[PDB]
Design a protein around this nucleic acid. Structure first.
Length: 66
DNA sequence: CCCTGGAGAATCCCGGTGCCGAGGCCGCTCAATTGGTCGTAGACAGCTCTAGCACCGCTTAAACGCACGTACGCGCTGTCCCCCGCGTTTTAACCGCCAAGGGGATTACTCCCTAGTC
């Protein structure tokens, strides 16, 4: 919550965050992340290795379409 | 040990002629402006009400350092297997050949539609 208020101040100063509807956002972000780790884990086992290098993450970003 | 003169060959490039179509020109042409209405929907408060800002003290739940430790990404070794460049062969569209209808126009015979006067 502190982080999102911090990145919301510069977009619009004195932005009052409603204490509701933030759980939905905080579930959607985690959902997209766990999708990213599952994709990078598939890429990792594709590389016969369990650890994660930057390469897997950047190619996941590029091949997903952003 | 590793570097290169020569050679083979791919690249960049501007003359240098032929072509077909981008753009201009001509002739319609139909749809955006504009007069009005009349009534619709959003701006302007206005009362309300409702969630959040900051504050207080706790509670151990996470967070972080330290130390062990240990095994995996990466880099070394080697082989082996399989795919490419080149040489030879075969499907694969494309354009000519022929004699016959189909038909669309095109014109010839004619035949009824039209219209004149002793």
């Amino acid at each position: 919550q502190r982080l999102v208020r911090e990145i919301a101040q510069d977009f619009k100063t004195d932005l009052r965050f409603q204490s509701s509807a933030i759980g939905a956002l905080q579930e959607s972000v985690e959902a997209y992340l766990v999708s990213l780790f599952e994709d990078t884990n598939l890429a990792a086992i594709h590389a016969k290795r369990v650890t994660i290098m930057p390469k897997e993450i950047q190619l996941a970003r590029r091949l997903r379409g952003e």
